[PDB]
mmCIF file of C-alpha atoms in Angstrom:
data_model
loop_
_atom_site.group_PDB
_atom_site.id
_atom_site.type_symbol
_atom_site.label_atom_id
_atom_site.label_comp_id
_atom_site.label_asym_id
_atom_site.label_seq_id
_atom_site.Cartn_x
_atom_site.Cartn_y
_atom_site.Cartn_z
ATOM 1 C CA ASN A 1 -40.989 5.006 47.050
ATOM 2 C CA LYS A 2 -42.567 2.922 44.279
ATOM 3 C CA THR A 3 -40.631 3.794 42.339
ATOM 4 C CA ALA A 4 -38.008 6.208 43.814
ATOM 5 C CA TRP A 5 -39.063 9.850 43.233
ATOM 6 C CA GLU A 6 -36.717 12.243 41.430
ATOM 7 C CA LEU A 7 -37.664 15.755 42.610
ATOM 8 C CA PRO A 8 -35.959 19.065 41.801
ATOM 9 C CA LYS A 9 -34.248 20.971 44.626
ATOM 10 C CA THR A 10 -37.188 23.399 44.628
ATOM 11 C CA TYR A 11 -39.343 20.792 46.372
ATOM 12 C CA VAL A 12 -38.128 19.454 49.680
ATOM 13 C CA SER A 13 -39.009 17.117 52.554
ATOM 14 C CA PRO A 14 -40.875 14.430 50.556
ATOM 15 C CA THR A 15 -43.438 12.902 52.932
ATOM 16 C CA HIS A 16 -45.502 10.080 51.385
ATOM 17 C CA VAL A 17 -49.334 9.959 51.455
ATOM 18 C CA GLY A 18 -50.849 7.896 48.616
ATOM 19 C CA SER A 19 -49.689 4.805 46.733
ATOM 20 C CA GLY A 20 -50.171 2.523 43.733
ATOM 21 C CA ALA A 21 -48.619 0.905 40.652
ATOM 22 C CA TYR A 22 -49.857 3.674 38.342
ATOM 23 C CA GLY A 23 -47.807 6.103 40.424
ATOM 24 C CA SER A 24 -47.860 7.746 43.839
ATOM 25 C CA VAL A 25 -48.868 10.972 45.503
ATOM 26 C CA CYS A 26 -46.685 12.634 48.133
ATOM 27 C CA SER A 27 -46.613 15.914 50.074
ATOM 28 C CA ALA A 28 -43.691 18.320 49.727
ATOM 29 C CA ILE A 29 -42.664 21.867 50.590
ATOM 30 C CA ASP A 30 -41.927 24.390 47.864
ATOM 31 C CA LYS A 31 -38.651 26.063 48.870
ATOM 32 C CA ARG A 32 -39.336 29.217 46.885
ATOM 33 C CA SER A 33 -42.614 30.108 48.599
ATOM 34 C CA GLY A 34 -42.768 27.851 51.637
ATOM 35 C CA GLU A 35 -46.149 26.484 50.621
ATOM 36 C CA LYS A 36 -47.064 22.859 51.164
ATOM 37 C CA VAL A 37 -47.969 21.122 47.921
ATOM 38 C CA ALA A 38 -49.210 17.826 46.570
ATOM 39 C CA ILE A 39 -47.043 16.109 43.998
ATOM 40 C CA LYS A 40 -48.406 13.319 41.828
ATOM 41 C CA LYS A 41 -46.091 11.060 39.868
ATOM 42 C CA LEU A 42 -47.161 9.531 36.559
ATOM 43 C CA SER A 43 -44.801 6.563 36.646
ATOM 44 C CA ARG A 44 -45.885 4.627 33.550
ATOM 45 C CA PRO A 45 -47.660 7.041 31.224
ATOM 46 C CA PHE A 46 -45.965 5.642 28.105
ATOM 47 C CA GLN A 47 -46.706 1.931 28.591
ATOM 48 C CA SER A 48 -49.517 2.090 26.025
ATOM 49 C CA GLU A 49 -51.402 4.423 23.711
ATOM 50 C CA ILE A 50 -54.250 4.681 26.207
ATOM 51 C CA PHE A 51 -51.964 5.531 29.128
ATOM 52 C CA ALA A 52 -50.242 8.138 26.954
ATOM 53 C CA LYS A 53 -53.494 9.707 25.749
ATOM 54 C CA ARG A 54 -54.790 9.848 29.326
ATOM 55 C CA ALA A 55 -51.587 11.468 30.595
ATOM 56 C CA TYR A 56 -51.982 14.119 27.902
ATOM 57 C CA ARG A 57 -55.633 14.760 28.758
ATOM 58 C CA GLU A 58 -54.853 15.041 32.458
ATOM 59 C CA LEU A 59 -52.010 17.525 31.950
ATOM 60 C CA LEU A 60 -53.916 19.818 29.597
ATOM 61 C CA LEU A 61 -57.083 19.731 31.683
ATOM 62 C CA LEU A 62 -55.109 20.622 34.813
ATOM 63 C CA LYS A 63 -53.324 23.315 32.842
ATOM 64 C CA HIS A 64 -56.331 25.170 31.409
ATOM 65 C CA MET A 65 -58.634 25.011 34.444
ATOM 66 C CA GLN A 66 -59.262 27.957 36.749
ATOM 67 C CA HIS A 67 -61.969 27.615 39.360
ATOM 68 C CA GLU A 68 -62.166 27.833 43.137
ATOM 69 C CA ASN A 69 -63.648 24.331 43.418
ATOM 70 C CA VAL A 70 -61.330 22.603 40.948
ATOM 71 C CA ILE A 71 -57.746 21.615 41.747
ATOM 72 C CA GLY A 72 -55.221 23.823 39.933
ATOM 73 C CA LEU A 73 -51.790 23.139 38.459
ATOM 74 C CA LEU A 74 -48.898 24.861 40.240
ATOM 75 C CA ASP A 75 -46.077 23.145 38.380
ATOM 76 C CA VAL A 76 -45.165 20.182 36.152
ATOM 77 C CA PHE A 77 -41.704 18.663 35.645
ATOM 78 C CA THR A 78 -39.752 15.633 34.490
ATOM 79 C CA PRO A 79 -36.216 14.473 35.416
ATOM 80 C CA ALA A 80 -35.686 13.762 31.710
ATOM 81 C CA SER A 81 -33.217 15.853 29.700
ATOM 82 C CA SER A 82 -34.805 15.067 26.331
ATOM 83 C CA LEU A 83 -37.263 12.732 24.596
ATOM 84 C CA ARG A 84 -34.530 10.068 24.650
ATOM 85 C CA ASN A 85 -34.896 9.538 28.411
ATOM 86 C CA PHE A 86 -38.526 10.617 28.920
ATOM 87 C CA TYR A 87 -40.246 7.902 30.986
ATOM 88 C CA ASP A 88 -42.398 9.758 33.509
ATOM 89 C CA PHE A 89 -43.396 13.142 34.893
ATOM 90 C CA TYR A 90 -44.781 14.844 37.954
ATOM 91 C CA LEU A 91 -47.722 17.137 38.502
ATOM 92 C CA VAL A 92 -47.649 19.713 41.282
ATOM 93 C CA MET A 93 -50.803 21.203 42.794
ATOM 94 C CA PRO A 94 -52.008 22.892 46.018
ATOM 95 C CA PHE A 95 -51.900 20.645 49.049
ATOM 96 C CA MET A 96 -55.315 20.199 50.608
ATOM 97 C CA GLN A 97 -55.674 18.413 53.997
ATOM 98 C CA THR A 98 -58.065 15.500 53.726
ATOM 99 C CA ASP A 99 -60.614 14.193 51.243
ATOM 100 C CA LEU A 100 -64.262 13.243 51.549
ATOM 101 C CA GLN A 101 -63.580 9.489 51.642
ATOM 102 C CA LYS A 102 -61.598 9.785 54.866
ATOM 103 C CA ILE A 103 -64.304 11.661 56.798
ATOM 104 C CA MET A 104 -67.385 9.695 55.690
ATOM 105 C CA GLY A 105 -67.689 8.283 59.201
ATOM 106 C CA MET A 106 -68.307 11.805 60.486
ATOM 107 C CA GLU A 107 -71.879 12.992 61.029
ATOM 108 C CA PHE A 108 -72.900 15.408 58.300
ATOM 109 C CA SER A 109 -75.629 17.875 59.192
ATOM 110 C CA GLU A 110 -77.789 19.121 56.327
ATOM 111 C CA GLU A 111 -76.046 22.477 56.521
ATOM 112 C CA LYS A 112 -72.675 20.822 55.814
ATOM 113 C CA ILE A 113 -74.185 18.651 53.090
ATOM 114 C CA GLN A 114 -75.742 21.742 51.526
ATOM 115 C CA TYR A 115 -72.433 23.587 51.601
ATOM 116 C CA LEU A 116 -70.224 20.750 50.368
ATOM 117 C CA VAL A 117 -72.508 19.441 47.601
ATOM 118 C CA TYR A 118 -73.074 23.023 46.446
ATOM 119 C CA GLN A 119 -69.315 23.350 45.933
ATOM 120 C CA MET A 120 -69.226 20.063 44.029
ATOM 121 C CA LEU A 121 -71.858 21.318 41.598
ATOM 122 C CA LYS A 122 -70.204 24.729 41.194
ATOM 123 C CA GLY A 123 -66.975 23.033 40.159
ATOM 124 C CA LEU A 124 -68.921 20.608 38.021
ATOM 125 C CA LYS A 125 -70.775 23.424 36.247
ATOM 126 C CA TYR A 126 -67.385 24.879 35.448
ATOM 127 C CA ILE A 127 -65.886 21.576 34.250
ATOM 128 C CA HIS A 128 -68.931 20.769 32.132
ATOM 129 C CA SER A 129 -69.028 24.283 30.629
ATOM 130 C CA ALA A 130 -65.546 23.640 29.271
ATOM 131 C CA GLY A 131 -67.180 20.736 27.431
ATOM 132 C CA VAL A 132 -65.484 18.260 29.736
ATOM 133 C CA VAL A 133 -66.793 15.163 31.516
ATOM 134 C CA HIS A 134 -64.954 13.994 34.688
ATOM 135 C CA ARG A 135 -65.973 10.316 34.711
ATOM 136 C CA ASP A 136 -64.547 9.483 38.129
ATOM 137 C CA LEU A 137 -66.331 11.594 40.733
ATOM 138 C CA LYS A 138 -66.131 9.842 44.101
ATOM 139 C CA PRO A 139 -65.458 10.791 47.755
ATOM 140 C CA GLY A 140 -61.755 10.008 47.338
ATOM 141 C CA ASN A 141 -61.575 12.640 44.594
ATOM 142 C CA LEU A 142 -63.145 15.416 46.651
ATOM 143 C CA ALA A 143 -60.524 17.290 48.654
ATOM 144 C CA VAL A 144 -61.613 19.215 51.753
ATOM 145 C CA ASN A 145 -59.695 21.556 54.093
ATOM 146 C CA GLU A 146 -60.456 22.567 57.704
ATOM 147 C CA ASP A 147 -62.775 25.348 56.436
ATOM 148 C CA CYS A 148 -64.888 22.773 54.573
ATOM 149 C CA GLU A 149 -63.623 24.282 51.320
ATOM 150 C CA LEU A 150 -63.902 21.704 48.547
ATOM 151 C CA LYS A 151 -61.872 20.998 45.417
ATOM 152 C CA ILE A 152 -62.462 18.443 42.668
ATOM 153 C CA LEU A 153 -59.487 16.177 41.979
ATOM 154 C CA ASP A 154 -58.062 13.643 39.522
ATOM 155 C CA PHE A 155 -58.532 14.364 35.840
ATOM 156 C CA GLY A 156 -56.884 11.092 34.869
ATOM 157 C CA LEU A 157 -60.131 9.701 33.480
ATOM 158 C CA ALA A 158 -61.556 13.027 32.288
ATOM 159 C CA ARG A 159 -61.908 14.130 28.673
ATOM 160 C CA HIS A 160 -63.759 16.317 26.237
ATOM 161 C CA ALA A 161 -67.306 14.965 25.988
ATOM 162 C CA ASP A 162 -68.137 13.327 22.661
ATOM 163 C CA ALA A 163 -70.974 11.289 21.165
ATOM 164 C CA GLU A 164 -68.902 8.132 21.466
ATOM 165 C CA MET A 165 -66.664 7.721 24.484
ATOM 166 C CA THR A 166 -64.801 4.917 26.292
ATOM 167 C CA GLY A 167 -67.228 2.356 27.724
ATOM 168 C CA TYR A 168 -65.877 1.114 31.045
ATOM 169 C CA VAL A 169 -65.701 4.348 33.047
ATOM 170 C CA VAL A 170 -66.336 5.684 36.579
ATOM 171 C CA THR A 171 -65.839 3.773 39.805
ATOM 172 C CA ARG A 172 -68.517 1.088 40.036
ATOM 173 C CA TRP A 173 -70.336 2.224 43.193
ATOM 174 C CA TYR A 174 -70.726 5.726 41.762
ATOM 175 C CA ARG A 175 -71.296 4.630 38.177
ATOM 176 C CA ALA A 176 -74.529 5.699 36.463
ATOM 177 C CA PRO A 177 -76.808 2.985 35.010
ATOM 178 C CA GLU A 178 -76.520 4.333 31.467
ATOM 179 C CA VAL A 179 -72.796 3.529 31.421
ATOM 180 C CA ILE A 180 -73.926 -0.096 31.159
ATOM 181 C CA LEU A 181 -77.392 0.308 29.565
ATOM 182 C CA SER A 182 -76.207 2.733 26.894
ATOM 183 C CA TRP A 183 -72.655 1.415 26.412
ATOM 184 C CA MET A 184 -70.201 4.120 25.218
ATOM 185 C CA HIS A 185 -73.025 6.640 24.699
ATOM 186 C CA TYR A 186 -73.426 8.589 27.924
ATOM 187 C CA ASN A 187 -72.923 12.301 28.561
ATOM 188 C CA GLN A 188 -71.874 14.768 31.271
ATOM 189 C CA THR A 189 -74.782 13.696 33.490
ATOM 190 C CA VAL A 190 -72.802 10.620 34.602
ATOM 191 C CA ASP A 191 -71.050 13.077 36.880
ATOM 192 C CA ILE A 192 -74.389 14.242 38.302
ATOM 193 C CA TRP A 193 -75.239 10.637 39.174
ATOM 194 C CA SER A 194 -71.944 10.334 41.060
ATOM 195 C CA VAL A 195 -72.803 13.508 42.971
ATOM 196 C CA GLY A 196 -76.136 11.956 43.899
ATOM 197 C CA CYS A 197 -74.475 8.776 45.180
ATOM 198 C CA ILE A 198 -72.057 10.861 47.242
ATOM 199 C CA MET A 199 -74.733 13.081 48.784
ATOM 200 C CA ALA A 200 -76.773 10.031 49.813
ATOM 201 C CA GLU A 201 -73.621 8.635 51.423
ATOM 202 C CA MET A 202 -73.090 11.822 53.456
ATOM 203 C CA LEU A 203 -76.740 11.634 54.459
ATOM 204 C CA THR A 204 -76.548 8.061 55.754
ATOM 205 C CA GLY A 205 -72.897 7.174 56.315
ATOM 206 C CA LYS A 206 -73.464 4.243 53.958
ATOM 207 C CA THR A 207 -72.668 3.707 50.278
ATOM 208 C CA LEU A 208 -75.987 3.672 48.431
ATOM 209 C CA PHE A 209 -75.191 1.212 45.633
ATOM 210 C CA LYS A 210 -72.593 -1.404 46.578
ATOM 211 C CA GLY A 211 -72.607 -3.793 43.622
ATOM 212 C CA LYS A 212 -70.228 -6.759 43.550
ATOM 213 C CA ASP A 213 -69.589 -6.484 39.807
ATOM 214 C CA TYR A 214 -70.589 -4.141 36.995
ATOM 215 C CA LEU A 215 -73.839 -6.011 36.372
ATOM 216 C CA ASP A 216 -74.881 -6.305 40.033
ATOM 217 C CA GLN A 217 -74.385 -2.532 40.312
ATOM 218 C CA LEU A 218 -77.146 -2.155 37.731
ATOM 219 C CA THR A 219 -79.333 -4.526 39.764
ATOM 220 C CA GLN A 220 -78.695 -2.492 42.931
ATOM 221 C CA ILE A 221 -79.552 0.719 41.087
ATOM 222 C CA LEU A 222 -82.786 -0.652 39.624
ATOM 223 C CA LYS A 223 -83.905 -1.570 43.162
ATOM 224 C CA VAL A 224 -84.041 2.068 44.250
ATOM 225 C CA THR A 225 -84.840 3.275 40.761
ATOM 226 C CA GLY A 226 -87.832 1.397 39.391
ATOM 227 C CA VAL A 227 -87.779 -0.764 36.288
ATOM 228 C CA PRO A 228 -88.873 1.715 33.564
ATOM 229 C CA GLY A 229 -91.980 1.575 31.379
ATOM 230 C CA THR A 230 -92.085 0.763 27.670
ATOM 231 C CA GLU A 231 -91.434 4.441 26.948
ATOM 232 C CA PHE A 232 -87.846 4.192 28.202
ATOM 233 C CA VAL A 233 -87.349 0.689 26.809
ATOM 234 C CA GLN A 234 -87.913 2.032 23.295
ATOM 235 C CA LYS A 235 -86.019 5.224 24.181
ATOM 236 C CA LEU A 236 -82.720 3.350 23.948
ATOM 237 C CA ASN A 237 -80.650 2.343 20.929
ATOM 238 C CA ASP A 238 -79.643 -1.143 22.048
ATOM 239 C CA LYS A 239 -81.213 -4.602 21.746
ATOM 240 C CA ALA A 240 -78.854 -6.133 24.295
ATOM 241 C CA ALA A 241 -80.002 -3.570 26.845
ATOM 242 C CA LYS A 242 -83.604 -4.250 25.851
ATOM 243 C CA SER A 243 -82.918 -7.742 27.251
ATOM 244 C CA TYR A 244 -82.266 -8.069 31.037
ATOM 245 C CA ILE A 245 -84.877 -5.307 31.317
ATOM 246 C CA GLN A 246 -87.144 -7.779 29.497
ATOM 247 C CA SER A 247 -86.842 -9.940 32.609
ATOM 248 C CA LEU A 248 -89.100 -7.188 34.028
ATOM 249 C CA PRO A 249 -88.555 -7.548 37.732
ATOM 250 C CA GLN A 250 -91.097 -4.856 38.501
ATOM 251 C CA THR A 251 -92.074 -2.546 41.345
ATOM 252 C CA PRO A 252 -91.361 0.979 40.144
ATOM 253 C CA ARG A 253 -90.636 3.511 41.488
ATOM 254 C CA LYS A 254 -89.622 4.037 45.122
ATOM 255 C CA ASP A 255 -90.388 7.256 47.019
ATOM 256 C CA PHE A 256 -87.277 8.884 48.489
ATOM 257 C CA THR A 257 -89.071 10.203 51.568
ATOM 258 C CA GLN A 258 -89.699 6.643 52.760
ATOM 259 C CA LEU A 259 -86.304 5.619 51.408
ATOM 260 C CA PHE A 260 -84.355 8.452 53.036
ATOM 261 C CA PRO A 261 -85.951 9.130 56.438
ATOM 262 C CA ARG A 262 -84.770 11.945 58.704
ATOM 263 C CA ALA A 263 -83.850 13.813 55.551
ATOM 264 C CA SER A 264 -85.677 16.926 54.355
ATOM 265 C CA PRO A 265 -88.459 16.842 51.735
ATOM 266 C CA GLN A 266 -86.314 18.950 49.446
ATOM 267 C CA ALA A 267 -83.098 16.974 50.130
ATOM 268 C CA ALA A 268 -84.980 13.854 49.087
ATOM 269 C CA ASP A 269 -86.254 15.747 46.047
ATOM 270 C CA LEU A 270 -82.714 16.701 44.984
ATOM 271 C CA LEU A 271 -81.425 13.113 45.347
ATOM 272 C CA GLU A 272 -84.389 12.024 43.259
ATOM 273 C CA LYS A 273 -83.613 14.479 40.449
ATOM 274 C CA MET A 274 -79.941 13.607 40.534
ATOM 275 C CA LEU A 275 -80.510 9.844 40.663
ATOM 276 C CA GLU A 276 -82.983 9.920 37.805
ATOM 277 C CA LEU A 277 -82.708 6.835 35.582
ATOM 278 C CA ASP A 278 -83.616 8.606 32.366
ATOM 279 C CA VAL A 279 -80.726 10.859 31.371
ATOM 280 C CA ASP A 280 -83.079 13.432 29.829
ATOM 281 C CA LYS A 281 -85.061 13.853 33.032
ATOM 282 C CA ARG A 282 -81.835 14.045 35.031
ATOM 283 C CA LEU A 283 -80.580 17.274 36.556
ATOM 284 C CA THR A 284 -77.578 19.011 34.961
ATOM 285 C CA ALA A 285 -74.960 20.832 37.056
ATOM 286 C CA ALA A 286 -76.288 24.301 36.211
ATOM 287 C CA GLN A 287 -79.853 23.169 36.901
ATOM 288 C CA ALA A 288 -78.946 21.463 40.185
ATOM 289 C CA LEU A 289 -77.454 24.686 41.514
ATOM 290 C CA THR A 290 -80.915 26.299 41.138
ATOM 291 C CA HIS A 291 -82.604 23.706 43.370
ATOM 292 C CA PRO A 292 -84.364 25.047 46.535
ATOM 293 C CA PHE A 293 -82.046 22.840 48.614
ATOM 294 C CA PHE A 294 -79.189 25.293 48.063
ATOM 295 C CA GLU A 295 -81.052 28.551 48.753
ATOM 296 C CA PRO A 296 -79.258 29.300 52.048
ATOM 297 C CA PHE A 297 -75.837 29.106 50.350
ATOM 298 C CA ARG A 298 -76.492 29.943 46.701
ATOM 299 C CA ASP A 299 -74.664 32.912 45.174
ATOM 300 C CA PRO A 300 -74.958 33.018 41.352
ATOM 301 C CA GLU A 301 -71.967 35.359 41.008
ATOM 302 C CA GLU A 302 -69.567 32.641 42.143
ATOM 303 C CA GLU A 303 -71.102 30.037 39.811
ATOM 304 C CA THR A 304 -68.568 30.934 37.120
ATOM 305 C CA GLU A 305 -67.874 29.004 33.936
ATOM 306 C CA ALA A 306 -65.011 28.391 31.530
ATOM 307 C CA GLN A 307 -63.661 31.422 29.706
ATOM 308 C CA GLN A 308 -62.435 29.115 26.931
ATOM 309 C CA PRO A 309 -63.638 25.718 25.666
ATOM 310 C CA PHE A 310 -61.173 22.924 26.419
ATOM 311 C CA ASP A 311 -59.371 22.006 23.192
ATOM 312 C CA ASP A 312 -60.034 18.538 21.779
ATOM 313 C CA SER A 313 -57.976 18.705 18.575
ATOM 314 C CA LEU A 314 -55.935 15.567 19.264
ATOM 315 C CA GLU A 315 -58.917 13.689 20.632
ATOM 316 C CA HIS A 316 -59.926 12.472 17.175
ATOM 317 C CA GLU A 317 -56.378 11.719 16.055
ATOM 318 C CA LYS A 318 -54.306 8.518 15.916
ATOM 319 C CA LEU A 319 -50.976 9.139 17.619
ATOM 320 C CA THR A 320 -48.252 6.665 18.485
ATOM 321 C CA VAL A 321 -46.850 6.623 22.015
ATOM 322 C CA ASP A 322 -43.795 8.415 20.627
ATOM 323 C CA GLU A 323 -46.073 11.106 19.206
ATOM 324 C CA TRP A 324 -47.985 11.434 22.476
ATOM 325 C CA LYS A 325 -44.649 11.826 24.332
ATOM 326 C CA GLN A 326 -43.664 14.666 22.014
ATOM 327 C CA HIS A 327 -46.865 16.584 22.680
ATOM 328 C CA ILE A 328 -46.692 15.906 26.420
ATOM 329 C CA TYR A 329 -43.014 16.837 26.668
ATOM 330 C CA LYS A 330 -43.714 19.971 24.624
ATOM 331 C CA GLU A 331 -46.576 20.978 26.967
ATOM 332 C CA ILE A 332 -44.415 20.321 30.032
ATOM 333 C CA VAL A 333 -41.621 22.660 28.986
ATOM 334 C CA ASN A 334 -43.743 25.682 27.994
ATOM 335 C CA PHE A 335 -44.974 26.273 31.535
ATOM 336 C CA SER A 336 -45.372 28.832 32.958
ATOM 337 C CA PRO A 337 -43.453 32.152 32.679
#
C-alpha cells in the first residue's frame, strides 16, 4: 500500500500503521521467532543525492547503535537481485505499541514525566556520545510501550555532528532558535531544545511554540525567552541575524515559575536550562541527567555511552547516486551472521 510492499516469506501478516510519499511503516510478524516487528519502507531513496545520502546515514546509524532507549535494527532487506534493479529497501526493528504523540492528551504526573524524559536523555547521551546529532526529536519519534519504556526513533535526519551542517532541520515546533539565528552552525544541543519543548508539552497538554512559519517560530520562542543583551548579539557570527534582533522588541526574560504554574520549582528549573537561548549556557544530555529533577529515578550505571564513535568517512565525500547505492547495497547484504 503506497506503493505495494514486497516482503520476504519470513515476515507475515502485513498490517498497515503509518503512511506517506517517502515510504510507509507497517507491522508484521516474524515467522522465525514469532515476534511482532515494525517494518519501514524507504520507497524513493535514490531519487536524489540527498535522499541517497540520508538513506545511507539512517541505515548505518541504525546498524551501529546499541542502547535500551534507542530503537535497534533487527533486519534489513531489499527485493532487488542486484544493483541493476535496486530501487528501495526495508528496515526491520522491534515493534513498540504507541508513541508519545498519540498519548499527549493523557494527563502526565510529574513522576511519569520524570521517568519518560529521563529515558529520552539517557538515549540522547548515548546518541550524542557517538558524535551524532538526531535533528528531529519530537513526540511522534518517541516510542512508548505499556510499561512506559521509551525508545528514540527515526534516524532519517540524523548524522555525524560537524561544524557546518544542513540548515533547514528539525520539525518547526520543536526547532531550536539557533537553527535560524545561527544558520547551518548549530550543535547537538538542538536535540536538548526539542526535549525541552516535549517536556513542557507533557506538563501542559499544549505545544509550547506553535509558529506558523519558520520565522514566526523564532518570534514565539523569543516571547518566552527574552530578547538577549548586547553580549549575545555580538556573540554570533552573522549580520543578518544581528538584524531582526535589532528591532529589539524587549522584555527579557520570563520566569518559568509564573510561566509554568502547578509545576515544581525544579521542573521549571530544568525546562529553563533546556530552553536556554544561548547554546553555551544550555544543558547537554549528560549534564541534564545530573539535574535534581531526576534524583528519584537516576541510576548512573544505566547511563551508558557508545563503545565506538559513529564513522563519518563518507560524510565529507562527493558520491553520485549510483555510488551511494553501491555502499547502501553493500551494507544491506553483510548483515548479520
